[PDB]
Amino acid sequence: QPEPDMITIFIGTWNMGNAPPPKKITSWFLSKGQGKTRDDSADYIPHDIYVIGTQEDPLSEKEWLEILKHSLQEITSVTFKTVAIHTLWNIRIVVLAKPEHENRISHICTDNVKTGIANTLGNKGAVGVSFMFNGTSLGFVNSHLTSGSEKKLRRNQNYMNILRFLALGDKKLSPFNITHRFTHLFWFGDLNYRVDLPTWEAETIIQKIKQQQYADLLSHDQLLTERREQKVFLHFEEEEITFAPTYRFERLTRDKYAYTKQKATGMKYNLPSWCDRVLWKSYPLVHVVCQSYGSTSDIMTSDHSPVFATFEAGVTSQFVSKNGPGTVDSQGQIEFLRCYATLKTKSQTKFYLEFHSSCLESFVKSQEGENEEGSEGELVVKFGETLPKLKPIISDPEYLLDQHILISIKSSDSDESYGEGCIALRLEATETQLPIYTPLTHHGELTGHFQGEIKLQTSQ
């Protein structure tokens, strides 16, 4: 029974519009309909993991699990195992996996974040699941963000609150939020970003959709434009959108968008929009390939159409040698040369680095760097040659070149992280000085950069 080095992951997001689903939802899990769809020749091939995010979900967990399991069994003839299910209000995440993966999956976490204060705390937020799959950490977030075309800033704030406060993954990675804790992080949901065009243009927009001419609509998609201006989802990826806007439809057909202001909308227009989205962020130089991203055409109980995305995702095996785990492999070492952190902070305080990685017995604290001034006023923390030599638990290059080092730059005075980043050890060469780089973020906001050289020694 060989351990996989690749799995496929299905991500689904559906705002169910508080209505039970139709009797057949198989098209969703088959990635059929509009956009980048899955080849018919793959229909009987199960994905390894199915992650289902719903919003405005009127079903009990039991009712929805029974529908999902019966759907996958009908498609695949496989009885999928429940990894995790978590519900906040009407926001739900279900993770199903093939039974052969039961003993590959461990460290299952669930959490939720409620967004907003008083007025705004009551129905929006996120649920999430993480686990290990052999040597690979996987995180999944289903968020239902603030509605309304005029509230893109609120959505960006909701995103900020969710990535700060969602407690998934390894709690020993204390300086790191969910945007750094996982080999692969998938964030999906009713993100509620809208096509930001004048109200009077609604019929023009509908025309554009009927012509499958999305270019002029996507150029006004608030998620794409906010991402381009680095207001949200910094360092996340999204597949190109080639399907019609998934909101807001008249129920029981897909032929009609319902966009006009009504008492029930709070006298707001709902111009056709790509509310329903899947984004991801993987550690550098890990295999992740989007193999589908689209919407179904035949599921019409909601004012949203379901969205699907599928991924190839690189995974690693749970490595055991004669040495690690439980002792350093003295054959291996990670060295750092000419290392500098450039920070955006206006503060003048001493900094040190922490190195965190599952290839180390425990995190490593550096000595303090020496602060200098960049040309354009900036704080530059010099580490030069002073960073420690890291001693990985296993020196085998088949393990070590697949690993990553998380870096936090911490204030000596407060121990608060000013910036988090990640370095891949998937180098072009070993025993060779090679450039390294990571941006540094805090609360998912760009706070600086870390650059230098690495020199990696493996058993080879």
Ligand SMILES: CN1CCC[C@@H](OC(=O)c2ccco2)C1
């Ligand atoms: C929501 N945003 C997105 C950009 C980064 C961060 O921006 C601010 O906090 C801010 C204050 C004044 C102007 O920007 C949070």
